[PDB]
Design a binder for this molecule. Sequence first.
Ligand SMILES: C[As](C)(=O)[O-]
Ligand SMILES: C[As](C)(=O)[O-]
Ligand SMILES: [Zn+2]
Ligand SMILES: [Zn+2]
Ligand SMILES: [Zn+2]
Ligand SMILES: [Zn+2]
Ligand SMILES: [Zn+2]
Length: 76
Amino acid sequence: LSPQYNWVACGILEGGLKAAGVLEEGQYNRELAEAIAAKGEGFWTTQFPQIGDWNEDQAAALADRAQTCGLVKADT
Ligand SMILES: C[As](C)(=O)[O-]
Ligand SMILES: C[As](C)(=O)[O-]
Ligand SMILES: [Zn+2]
Ligand SMILES: [Zn+2]
Ligand SMILES: [Zn+2]
Ligand SMILES: [Zn+2]
Ligand SMILES: [Zn+2]
């Protein structure tokens, strides 16, 4: 795994997610995704469905990085 997947980078991720206040104990991938997407919900995402799409796709990407870092549990 390239330098972007070690426990250091993963630490930065966890730090980031705790700073955003989206990460919580016993959390699942999908839960975290909804949380990340809820934080960027507002004017741009409602008035523009595509930005809404982008938002959720990023949230999805981050929750996945989080899952690989073992920050959140796999879906059931
Ligand atoms: C060990 As902890 C406070 O990041 O769940
Ligand atoms: C997997 As955790 C949020 O207890 O460091
Ligand atoms: Zn914990
Ligand atoms: Zn998309
Ligand atoms: Zn949606
Ligand atoms: Zn995914
Ligand atoms: Zn932790």
